[PDB]
Every structure is written in structure tokens, then in C-alpha cells.
């Protein structure tokens with residue numbers, strides 16, 4: 084029952100230490116919760132164990148990065164093998180080639196790739212590649228979508244409630260002291276609203292190096308880009324020489340060939356991370372050989388220099404190769420089957436109870452919603468204070484009933500999970516829903 | 522065995538042919554490309570790196586100073602293997618982040634609080650972002666010709682234009698293609714080790730400057746440190762104007778138990794770190810005064826500067842970094858500094874005996890060979906002529922063929938598996954490489 088909140092808990096003592104040497108005891112904003120979060124001690128398979136000994140089924144998995152759960156034996160074997168050879172070198176290795184070979188074989192848009200140390204870095208380097216390829220300074224992204232901590236990609240991460248006078252989204256700062264020149268350089272588009280998107284892209288078509296889009300953004304309720312919208316976005320970006328960048332840092336796990344394969348639209352660049360590293364720090368930017376040529380150093384200095392001390396380090400390469408090789412087509416099918424079972428079970432729980440709600444998701448990703456507004460209008464994804472309080476009561480009850488999910492009730496399956504784990508989630512959700520309503 | 526990887530049908534040639542189909546020019550890290558194709562690392566042990574063609578060399582690069590304990594260090598490997606049984610990443614904080622933060626703040630005086638990132642590039646970016654959030658100001662200042670990673674604002678003028686503008690100050694020059702004019706306009710480029718021009722430029726831009734970012738001993742400028750009077754006056758003027766002073770110690774932190782800032786006696790507001798502090802695993806960190814780092818504090822409301830990161834403070838990096846740093850004791854710093862002095866003196870003697878003009882800079886376990894006698898205190902002297910580039914290239918290629926792996930600039934670093942035998946092997950190989958480069962027996 085959430086024993087970590089108790090005075091004198093292990094988590095409380097750890098937080099007391101942490102706040103002396105980390106700001107507010109924190110080094111990752113995402114994992115803070117008030118007054119202090121629980122601390123992880125270890126994990127095994129689908130189970131996370133906190134510093135106070137409480138065990139929970141992990142439906143977060145480091146925000147979808149650990150598709151194979153905790154301490155996967157195959158990844159551990161591969162990493163242990165690599166440790167004997169060394170973990171980083173100032174020379175390329177074959178391991179970077181092998182993972183690049185896998186990624187380019189699986190994702191149709193990927194003809195060549197480069198590895199980075201984070202999804203944030205992958206997004207930055209795709210933007211910089213688009214600037215180098217097109218010569219143009221500005222980028223466009225969609226209101227309310229998260230892409231990491233790079234200045235230009237994080238503009239309007241949190242939508243302002245209201246459009247400007249033109250009726251279009253407002254470029255709003257996500258970090259303090261954001262330069263006006265940064266805000267002014269970013270065109271903020273409305274997700275799944277093709278008319279406004281087309282009008283804004285047309286207005287800025289000569290200044291836009293790229294459009295950056297997450298195909299199934301978690302921050303907008305995990306409702307995917309609709310097919311007509313995404314096909315018209317592809318057509319207009321191609322028409323105006325604008326690089327289309329897909330942010331699949333989360334969504335790549337939707338399918339053997341990524342969400343771009345699911346939706347049938349081929350971007351010019353793709354940013355990736357999380358699962359492709361086997362649990363170790365990683366990102367990747369890839370796409371057409373034509374656009375990726377900005378990085379090519381063989382014909383003189385590259386148009387876009389891309390250094391990095393731990394780029395393509397063999398630990399990350401070996402772990403990611405192992406993680407991806409374990410993701411066979413049949414494994415994707417199993418994940419999608421279990422995800423469908425979870426989402427349908429949660430919908431039946433909502434129906435049987437008196438609670439209006441809906442569940443979005445695809446493959447092994449899901450998002451529970453305690454309202455029935457159409458998420459095809461992205462402004463409907465914003466929650467009121469009462470709705471936030473209700474979701475929070477459900478989340479805390481779940482935490483106390485052995486289920487670890489994000490505060491928004493966005494979650495993911497891990498390959499160690501089966502029907503028992505899904506049933507455990509659905510039963511715990513029924514009980515937590517009852518708790519939250521009193 | 523004389524650079525066998527360059528032969529047709531070598532392992533490296535086959536690997537390059539595969540690589541260029543799936544990587545741009547077969548490359549994923551610009552630094553490690555060399556023409557026509559680079560050698561490929563197969564494995565390492567202690568101070569020795571072994572390439573895919575079986576050729577072994579003493580490693581004086583160590584992933585650009587990150588692996589201060591050399592290859593496959595057993596203590597780091599044992600700690601990592603212990604952690605693997607527990608899991609490698611979590612969506613909760615762990616005690617391991619606390620342990621490494623406790624060590625770093627205990628050792629470096631300016632570090633009151635820290636946050637971990639996944640690269641030195643990220644550390645530099647988040648330091649710049651923290652300074653903007655703390656001061657509210659949009660622009661930053663950095664020094665001409667200095668490298669800080671791939672973040673847009675930090676990389677302006679990484680390669681100097683070579684000549685000043687009409688005002689006599691350095692030029693804000695693009696390092697990547699398509700750099701927006703607004704990015705160039707937001708960066709004030711200062712002259713390293715020229716306190717007069719530095720002060721005049723900061724004075725001119727004092728109301729718009731959130732931060733001055735400075736590498737205390739930049740490799741790009743020949744590894745000649747910021748001189749004490751220059752750095753003290755920089756500290757005074759930034760403090761007077763409310764400008765955040767950021768040290769980039771991603772490389773220089775290894776100079777001393779308390780960093781190069783402790784050597785030079787100047788307390789920055791923030792420090793960016795990386796490389797050694799991760800034990801060989803991807804890592805960065807930004808730390809400093811609790812006053813400035815409070816922009817990150819999420820208690821008591823939303824943080825002024827949000828800072829997420831899926832792999833931030835992952836337990837593998839935290840455990841490997843804790844082990845690596847715990848092994849770097851005061852006695853180890855002393856031993857590395859003695860070995861570095863011995864190497865540098867040996868190289869100076871080789872140059873003197875050969876009649877070849879040159880000099881060697883360095884500190885602790887870092888060194889830089891120069892095949893000229895220009896005073897590097899004038900930073901524009903660090904730029905090499907065509908003749909110097911060709912001659913240094915001959916020396917580097919000969920060293921590579923003589924069992925020595927060093928950077929093309931002849932910038933190098935020691936590792937803890939090294940002793941006097943490795944230093945003497947370096948000095949002997951350098952003498953032979955100099956003879957080769959001059960065409961002498």
C-alpha cells in the first residue's frame with residue numbers, strides 16, 4: 084500500500100540524501116513525484132522492486148525503452164561478452180555496422196543511419212541534417228508534442244490553451260529564458276487538422292527546413308495521425324522541398340517496420356531511441372541516402388559534422404542488436420494480441436462500472452482516458468483540474484495495488500508479460516477505479 | 522606490423538565496404554573517420570587496442586580521454602556485471618545516482634549539486650539552458666576555435682574563420698551547414714587568453730549575456746591552459762554583470778582530484794562534465810552552485826528549466842562511473858602526473874636531439890606534441906600551415922605503424938594501466954617516427 088510514502092521509509096531517507104547533492108533531489112524531471120518519488124532497487128522480468136521492498140508490475144519500462152523488461156538474460160549475456168573486449172573505442176567497430184544493417188533492413192525509409200547517445204540527440208541531429216540539406220533555418224512541429232530537451236524541438240511542448248489571433252497554435256516556451264529568436268524560428272502546427280497544417284506550411288514554405296512529427300504522440304492521448312492527414316502532409320512537404328522527420332523514438336515499437344510502416348507513409352528522416360539500445364543509452368537518426376549525405380565525410384569535410392564520444396559504443400550496439408533480434412514478427416504479434424486483450428479488458432471495466440472513458444493504443448502501447456471526448460481534435464486531450472485529480476486518484480490506487488504506470492495512465496507491455504499479467508492489470512484497474520470514486 | 526589495415530582485402534576494407542551501404546560514408550562519428558577508410562577496433566586490454574586486422578597498438582587516445590583506466594578494466598566490469606543482475610534502467614530514481622553525485626560534489630569545490638545527462642554535448646546544452654533560465658538572458662559567449670559538442674549554440678566558431686572582423690574581434694562562423702543567422706547572432710565569440718578583447722566584448726554585451734562558456738585547457742587550441750590573470754579577471758567581470766560562468770571540463774576534469782578549476786584556482790558557477798565520469802559508458806553531468814542549479818528543482822512547483830532524459834542516471838553508467846572515480850585516488854593522480862611529465866620531457870629531448878623545432882604542452886595525464894615553436898598563448902598560433910599538417914600527418918602515420926595509436930593532432934592521454942615501459946615505448950616510437958617523417962635512417 085505505497086509504503087514508501089510512510090515517514091522514515093527507505094525512499095524518504097534516500098530523498099533526504101539526494102536533495103543535498105541533486106536539485107530538489109532530482110536528475111530526471113519525468114520521474115519526480117511529490118513530495119518524493121519511490122526509489123527502484125531492482126527488477127526482474129515484468130516486476131519492479133522499490134527500495135522499501137514493494138513489488139509492482141512494471142507498465143512503464145523506462146518510458147517504453149525496456150521492451151524486454153528487467154534484466155533480460157539474452158541482453159545480459161551479450162553485454163557480458165562485450166565487456167571482456169572493451170566498452171568504447173576511438174575507432175569504429177563491426178557492431179555499429181550490424182545494428183545499422185538490422186535497422187535499414189527493417190524500416191523502409193532507412194537507407195542509412197547514424198547513432199547518437201539519446202533520442203534528444205537524434206531529434207537534434209535530424210533537425211540539423213534538414214537545415215544542412217535544405218539551407219533553410221526554420222522548423223515546424225505540432226502543438227503539445229514532446230521531442231526531448233533540444234531548444235527548437237521543445238517549443239510548445241505544453242500547448243497554450245488558446246490560439247492566437249490567426250486562429251493557429253501559439254509558440255510557447257517550455258524552458259525559462261527561451262530566446263525570442265528560438266520561439267520565432269518554430270512554426271507550430273495543429274495535429275490531425277490538415278487544413279490549418281497546410282495553410283501554415285504554405286505560409287512558411289520557403290523558410291522551413293523540416294516538419295517534425297510524432298506519428299502517435301503520447302502527450303496528445305496516444306491517438307495516431309490519421310491517414311488522410313499524414314498522406315497530405317507527405318505530399319506537401321515533398322512539394323516544397325521540406326524534410327519530413329518522423330519522431331519514432333517511442334512509436335518505432337509499434338511494428339516490425341515501425342509506425343511509418345503501419346501508416347504507409349515514408350518520411351525523409353526518422354529519429355529513434357529507447358528500445359533500439361537494449362536498455363543502454365542510445366539514439367539514431369536515419370533516412371534516405373540523399374538527405375543523410377550531409378553527414379558523409381568521404382568527399383571532404385561533411386556538410387554537417389556529427390561527433391560524439393559514445394556514439395555507437397559496442398555495449399549499446401550489442402544490447403540493441405540483441406533486443407531487436409528478439410523482436411521477431413511473431414513476437415510483435417504476441418505483443419499486439421496481449422495489448423488488445425488489455426485495452427478491451429479496461430474498456431469492459433469502464434463499461435461495467437458507471438464511468439465514461441476510452442482506451443487508445445496500438446500494439447503494446449495503451450492510454451486510458453476517463454472521458455469520451457474525440458481525441459481526433461487534439462485540444463480535447465487537455466484535462467481539467469477535476470479530471471487530473473480523478474486520474475491521480477486512480478494512479479495512486481494502482482501504485483498501491485501492485486501496478487506501476489505513468490501518472491497519465493499511459494503504459495506499455497513488456498515481452499515477459501502474458502495473459503496473467505494482463506489480467507492482473509485489468510483487475511487492479513477495476514479495484515483502483517472503485518477506490519478513486521469512493 | 523606497419524598499418525596492414527590499409528592493404529586491399531584487409532578486414533578494415535571489408536568492414537568499410539559493408540559500412541558504407543548502411544552508414545553515410547560508413548561513418549557514425551566524424552572524429553574517427555580517416556581516409557580512405559579508418560581501421561576498425563576489435564578489442565582492447567589494459568593499455569593495448571587491437572584492430573580487426575590483428576595489429577596491436579598502445580592506446581594513447583582512450584576514446585578521446587574517456588577511458589582513463591584503459592580497456593576492459595576488471596573492477597569496472599565486475600561492478601557492471603553485479604548491476605546487470607538488478608536491471609540497467611528504471612523509471613524511478615536509484616541510490617546509484619546519489620552515490621555518484623556524493624562523490625563528485627565531495628571532490629570538486631564548486632559542485633554543490635549535479636544532474637546527469639547522456640553526453641557531454643547534453644551537459645553543455647543543459648548548462649546553457651540553466652543559465653538562460655537563471656538569468657533570463659538569451660545570448661551566450663564562447664571562445665573562438667573551441668569545441669564543446671554538437672549543440673547549435675555551443676558549436677559556433679568551433680573552427681575559427683582565421684581572421685578577425687573589421688572591429689578586430691573574432692567572427693561568429695558556422696560549424697554546420699545551414700546554420701540560421703539567428704543562431705550565429707546569438708553567440709558572442711571571445712578571444713581565448715586575450716583578456717582585453719574578452720573584457721571589451723563582455724562589457725559591450727553585458728545586458729544580453731546569460732553565460733560565458735570556457736574550456737580551461739582546450740585541446741583545439743593546443744592544450745595550453747587559460748592563464749591565471751585572464752581567468753581571474755573573467756571571473757570578476759562575469760560576477761559583476763550577473764553572467765553565469767560555465768567551465769567545460771568534459772575533458773579537463775581529469776587534470777586533478779578537484780578538476781582543472783581547482784588547479785587554476787577559479788570557481789565557476791556551473792561545470793559541464795562527461796567522459797571519465799561514466800567508466801566508459803555514455804554520460805554527462807552539469808553541476809554547480811545550488812543557487813543556479815535551482816532552476817532544475819521540481820519541488821515547490823514546476824521547474825524553471827525542465828530536464829528529462831530516458832537514460833539520465835541509469836544505474837549502469839552510475840555504477841561504472843562510481844567505480845572509475847573511486848579508483849582515481851590522489852596517489853593515482855600523482856602517478857599519472859609523474860608519468861606525463863616523463864613522457865613530455867622525453868619527447869622534448871627527442872626533438873632537441875633530432876634538431877626538429879617543437880614543444881610539448883600538457884598537464885597531469887594529458888599532453889600535446891607540437892612541431893613548431895610558436896607561443897600558443899596567442900591562440901591563432903595553434904593553426905597549422907599546410908607544411909605542418911603534412912609533416913604531423915607523416916609522424917602520426919609512422920606512429921600508427923609503430924604500435925602507437927594517438928590522435929592526428931598528436932594530442933594524447935595516459936591510462937592507469939600504463940607505467941614507465943609504456944612511456945618509454947612511446948618516446949622511442951616517436952623518435953623513430955620523426956626519422957621516418959624526415960626520410961632519415
Ligand SMILES: Cc1ncc(COP(=O)(O)O)c(C)c1O
Nearest residue numbers: 201202203230231332333830831
Ligand atoms: C517522442 C520522443 N522523442 C524524443 C524523446 C527523447 O529521448 P531521450 O529521453 O532518450 O532523450 C522521447 C523520450 C520521446 O518519447
Ligand SMILES: Cc1ncc(COP(=O)(O)O)c(C)c1O
Nearest residue numbers: 391392640641642669670771772
Ligand atoms: C571539451 C569538450 N566538451 C564537450 C564534449 C562533448 O562530449 P560528448 O562527446 O560526450 O558529447 C567533448 C568531447 C569535449 O572534449
